[PDB]
Amino acid sequence: AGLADALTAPLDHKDKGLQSLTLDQSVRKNEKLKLAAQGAEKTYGNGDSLNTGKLKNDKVSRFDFIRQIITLESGEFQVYKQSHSALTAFQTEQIQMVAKRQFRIGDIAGEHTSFDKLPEGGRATYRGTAFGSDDAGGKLTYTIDFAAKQGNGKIEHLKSPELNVDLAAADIKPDGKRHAVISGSVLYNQAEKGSYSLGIFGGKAQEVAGSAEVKTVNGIRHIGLAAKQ
């Protein structure tokens, strides 16, 4: 799994990318984030980079984490790695300390595809993972038509069936940095049950990565999205 390696070894360009992720959302400027796994441990570090080069691609890598400012939060830290993108998530187990469960996406990082350098035509099919609290088994499928500058997709096979939602058709747009981004609706039985946001990643738009917020009978559930090709 190379989890320990990711905590002790320095960056090595020979490792499979994504080689490095810059932790920002995962750890605010005034805080410290400690990650532990396979006997090793390392503290971060707003702006510090996580050696994702040592982790397996297309899988969730898992660490124990403690977030300090004094302990504020602890639980499991999840990292899903692709070649030009990667994201982190926090499964909360403990807050101020008392037991409390929450799930949240942290950083979504990588080589953003410029909205101004997108392929001019053709369709791309992305296949990958949707992972939520206690469930990294979801299958994500997403299609972008670059002529139409539109995307849509679907989540399948998550254990909680009302998370298996339609990611409705949406426009590709530039954000503030000219990154290509897609924001749309989540649909379940034709009703809007939340929203999703994807960034396009890679110089040839090889990947999408982002998240979804899905309204369920038992409350809002947050999902991490990542697919490729």
């Epitope: 088994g137 299958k139 679907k154 989540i155 399948e156 096979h157 254990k159 909680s160 069936p161 009302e162 298996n164 939602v165 339609d166 649909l187 379940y188 039985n189 034709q190 009703a191 009978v217 038992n218």
Partner: antibody, heavy 122, light 109 residues
């Protein structure tokens, strides 16, 4: 094709234990809930509960919660229903079935196994 | 915990008749509702899901309507092969998808 093939009809004495099986094939075993349904001859369908093969998350309805145990064998993609102590009133047909779903829509039950007739008597 | 009840429990109608079965839930379940058909000695077969979505392979004389706590299965022209008992099922809750008690449909000839 997707198939769910259950084991043969059973006769057991009251108080005995019994494990019936449900062989799933033609699809990815760990992507779908397995569902168990009881039906007394001439009566309605009864949702007993379900189990997810991916991590063996088992759910039981109040009426069956202690009397039956769901389990799964991933290497053989087989689901199992087991009684530890049978009663005459357990005499009935039992279905397994896949919980299916089109993304963006409420799920349904199907395909179904052919059903297993369990007869409890001495 | 969610209770589904069907009416009638038994009905009889002539071939070509319009048949209506109603399904009720003890609480609002939006449109997360299925209809199944079951014939003698066979497992049930889904007809409709999400209250009104016709499964492929199922004849269009079957249609479903309603929402919240009140739902309807309609057979527009009862055919001989439609002899069966019909079940609703709520798929609203956290799994635990309970069935209505069933409605037997027989043909008047």
């Amino acid at each position: 094709e997707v198939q769910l093939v259950q084991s043969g009809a059973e006769l057991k004495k009251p108080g005995e234990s019994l494990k019936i099986s449900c062989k799933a094939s033609g699809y990815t075993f760990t992507n779908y809930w397995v569902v168990w349904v009881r039906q007394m001859p001439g009566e309605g369908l009864e949702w007993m509960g379900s189990i997810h093969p991916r991590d063996s998350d088992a759910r039981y309805s109040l009426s069956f919660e202690g009397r039956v145990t769901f389990s799964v064998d991933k290497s053989t993609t087989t689901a199992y229903l087991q009684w530890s102590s049978l009663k005459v009133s357990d005499s009935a047909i039992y279905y397994c079935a896949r919980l299916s779903q089109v993304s963006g829509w409420s799920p349904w039950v199907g395909p179904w196994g052919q059903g297993t007739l369990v007869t409890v008597s001495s | 915990d969610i209770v589904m009840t069907q009416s009638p429990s038994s009905l009889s109608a002539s071939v070509g008749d319009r048949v209506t079965i109603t399904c009720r839930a003890s609480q609002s379940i939006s449109v997360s509702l299925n209809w199944y058909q079951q014939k003698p000695g066979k497992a049930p077969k889904v007809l409709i899901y999400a209250a009104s979505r016709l499964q492929s392979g199922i004849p269009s004389r079957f249609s479903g309507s309603g929402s919240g706590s009140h739902f309807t299965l309609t057979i527009s022209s009862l055919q001989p092969e439609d002899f069966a008992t019909y079940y609703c099922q709520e798929t609203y809750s956290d799994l635990m998808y309970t069935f209505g008690q069933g409605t037997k449909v027989e043909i008047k000839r």
